[PDB]
């Protein structure tokens, strides 16, 4: 009855950030200290909760969102940030309660010749709202001339692919990210630390 964090953190495949994955966690016991100590993470940043307090708390639901971005973009996975990732792909709310966890995945997600499997949204008419997901792929009209289905200058396919090459600098290497959000509603709190 331990929470299935292994299925999230140790997943063989991770989503593209524009099509980010969400798993709901419920009705289970979670040791967050064990999680914290389970690997050499490069980011483990909590908001409104703390690593030292989580094992004494109960929540109605935990959501685990996961995806790949490049190293220099992990700083955008935080409340109050701007940039292509925060604005167009994955947005946290200002009042976020949870933890942002990341690790370098260059050994899995780069490839000689480039790994092109991971995508992000490069253009959007307006910013995302918090926890919004946009998987659309219609041509983006970047100027005032209508595109009429024809791509070219000022008429763009809206996604770009990372081109993860093993020799990239670390800021441009792939990082796997898990965002844990802790929700407390007027409902039974079924996700608890071992101290309960």
């Amino acid at each position, epitope marked *: 009855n331990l929470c299935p964090f292994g299925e999230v953190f140790n997943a063989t495949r991770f989503a593209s950030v524009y099509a980010w994955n969400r798993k709901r966690i419920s009705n289970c016991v979670a040791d967050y200290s064990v999680l914290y100590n389970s690997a050499s993470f490069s980011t483990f940043k909590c908001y409104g909760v703390s690593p030292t307090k989580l094992n004494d708390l109960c929540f109605t639901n935990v959501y685990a969102d996961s995806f790949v971005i490049r190293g220099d973009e992990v700083r955008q996975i935080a409340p109050g940030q701007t940039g292509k990732i925060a604005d167009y792909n994955y947005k946290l709310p200002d009042d976020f309660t949870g933890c942002v966890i990341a690790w370098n995945s260059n050994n899995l997600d780069s490839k000689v*010749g480039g790994n092109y499997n991971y995508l992000y949204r490069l253009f959007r008419k307006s910013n995302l709202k918090p926890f919004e997901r946009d998987i659309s*792929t219609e041509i983006y009209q970047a100027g005032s001339t209508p595109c009429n289905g024809v*791509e070219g200058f000022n008429c763009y396919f809206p*996604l770009q692919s990372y081109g993860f090459q093993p020799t990239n600098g670390v800021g441009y290497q792939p990082y796997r990210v898990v965002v844990l959000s802790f929700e407390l509603l007027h409902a039974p709190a079924t996700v608890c630390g071992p101290k309960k």
Partner: nanobody
Amino acid sequence: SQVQLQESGGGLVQPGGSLRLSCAASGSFFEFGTVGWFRQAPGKQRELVSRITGNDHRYYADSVKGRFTISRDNDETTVYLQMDSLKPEDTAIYHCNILEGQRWSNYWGQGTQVTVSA
């Protein structure tokens, strides 16, 4: 940040013939997640002929749909444009390019010449 896009594969063929263009990228750093093949006929506007983003999001201009195929090399930062069933109006200098931020980059090299002549 430096990139060189080496364009090759053009030639002189008869109508109905085929060519494979190659856009081979090298350098310390470049964004190869989107690659576009452009062409400019004499005294005409440059147009995007075909684009590939990621592994499998492709675009073809109406006039080449069904005749051209864009693809990636499996082991190298190279993209190919297979041009089949060539027509005289495909005659142009073909250029490949990549994105820099939210726009096609300012790279505009020597390209490769395609001539289709009856």
